[PDB]
Write an enzyme that holds these catalytic residues in place. Sequence first.
Site, PDB file in Angstrom:
ATOM      1  N   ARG A   2       1.372 -19.697   7.735  1.00  0.00           N
ATOM      2  CA  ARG A   2       2.778 -19.879   7.404  1.00  0.00           C
ATOM      3  C   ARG A   2       2.916 -20.174   5.917  1.00  0.00           C
ATOM      4  O   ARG A   2       1.966 -20.652   5.292  1.00  0.00           O
ATOM      5  CB  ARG A   2       3.362 -21.026   8.233  1.00  0.00           C
ATOM      6  CG  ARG A   2       3.046 -20.935   9.727  1.00  0.00           C
ATOM      7  CD  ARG A   2       3.297 -22.262  10.441  1.00  0.00           C
ATOM      8  NE  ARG A   2       3.338 -22.116  11.899  1.00  0.00           N
ATOM      9  CZ  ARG A   2       4.455 -22.012  12.622  1.00  0.00           C
ATOM     10  NH1 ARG A   2       5.649 -22.043  12.037  1.00  0.00           N
ATOM     11  NH2 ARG A   2       4.383 -21.880  13.941  1.00  0.00           N
ATOM     12  N   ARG A  12      10.548 -16.522   6.034  1.00  0.00           N
ATOM     13  CA  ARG A  12      10.463 -15.494   7.060  1.00  0.00           C
ATOM     14  C   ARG A  12      11.093 -14.188   6.572  1.00  0.00           C
ATOM     15  O   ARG A  12      11.749 -14.145   5.536  1.00  0.00           O
ATOM     16  CB  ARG A  12      11.169 -15.955   8.340  1.00  0.00           C
ATOM     17  CG  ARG A  12      10.743 -17.322   8.825  1.00  0.00           C
ATOM     18  CD  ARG A  12      11.543 -17.736  10.032  1.00  0.00           C
ATOM     19  NE  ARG A  12      11.195 -16.916  11.187  1.00  0.00           N
ATOM     20  CZ  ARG A  12      11.889 -15.865  11.607  1.00  0.00           C
ATOM     21  NH1 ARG A  12      12.969 -15.485  10.951  1.00  0.00           N
ATOM     22  NH2 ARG A  12      11.498 -15.200  12.692  1.00  0.00           N
ATOM     23  N   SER A  32       6.701 -10.377  24.126  1.00  0.00           N
ATOM     24  CA  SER A  32       5.852 -10.373  25.301  1.00  0.00           C
ATOM     25  C   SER A  32       6.185 -11.566  26.213  1.00  0.00           C
ATOM     26  O   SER A  32       6.255 -11.411  27.435  1.00  0.00           O
ATOM     27  CB  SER A  32       4.376 -10.385  24.893  1.00  0.00           C
ATOM     28  N   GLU A  61       4.640  -4.504  13.560  1.00  0.00           N
ATOM     29  CA  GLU A  61       4.027  -5.325  14.595  1.00  0.00           C
ATOM     30  C   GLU A  61       4.974  -5.580  15.788  1.00  0.00           C
ATOM     31  O   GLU A  61       4.591  -5.358  16.943  1.00  0.00           O
ATOM     32  CB  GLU A  61       3.539  -6.652  13.988  1.00  0.00           C
ATOM     33  CG  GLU A  61       2.412  -6.442  12.966  1.00  0.00           C
ATOM     34  CD  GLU A  61       1.911  -7.733  12.319  1.00  0.00           C
ATOM     35  OE1 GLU A  61       2.434  -8.820  12.642  1.00  0.00           O
ATOM     36  OE2 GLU A  61       0.989  -7.653  11.476  1.00  0.00           O
ATOM     37  N   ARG A  81      16.283 -25.177  11.978  1.00  0.00           N
ATOM     38  CA  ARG A  81      14.852 -24.941  12.127  1.00  0.00           C
ATOM     39  C   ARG A  81      14.141 -24.985  10.778  1.00  0.00           C
ATOM     40  O   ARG A  81      12.922 -24.870  10.721  1.00  0.00           O
ATOM     41  CB  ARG A  81      14.595 -23.589  12.794  1.00  0.00           C
ATOM     42  CG  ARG A  81      15.499 -23.281  13.977  1.00  0.00           C
ATOM     43  CD  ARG A  81      14.709 -22.679  15.128  1.00  0.00           C
ATOM     44  NE  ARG A  81      13.550 -23.504  15.451  1.00  0.00           N
ATOM     45  CZ  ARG A  81      12.301 -23.053  15.490  1.00  0.00           C
ATOM     46  NH1 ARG A  81      12.051 -21.774  15.239  1.00  0.00           N
ATOM     47  NH2 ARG A  81      11.300 -23.877  15.783  1.00  0.00           N
TER      48      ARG A  81
END
Length: 131
Positions: A2, A12, A32, A61, A81
């Site tokens: 990170r 991000r 997923s 990805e 966040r």
Amino acid sequence: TRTYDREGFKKRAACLCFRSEQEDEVLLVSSSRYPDQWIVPGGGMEPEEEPGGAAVREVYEEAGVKGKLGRLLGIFENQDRKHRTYVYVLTVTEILEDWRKREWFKVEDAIKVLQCHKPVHAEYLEKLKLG
């Protein structure tokens, strides 16, 4: 790994992947672990990455697509966040077969879907209408 800015925000990148230059239909995906949740593809920047590099990597990805990277829509700050997300637009040129789900959505329907699934991502698409 990170990476963080000097104000302690996690860096991000995310990307609105469009079917064409019209920017009428956007690709949404599900992960997923939460397959019934539609999201915009994106994730953390790696330490030595540029935001556009992160964006391009994340759509490969998490969405299994390649395309032409477009403008920076904006930097979206999520104070709940402590995220700062560089959100780009990208015109999809290739959909990688044998790649979780992914569907085209008209922008307005995408906003409605995301308002329930992932409100913060809905703001990305709202920015298109905002200007």
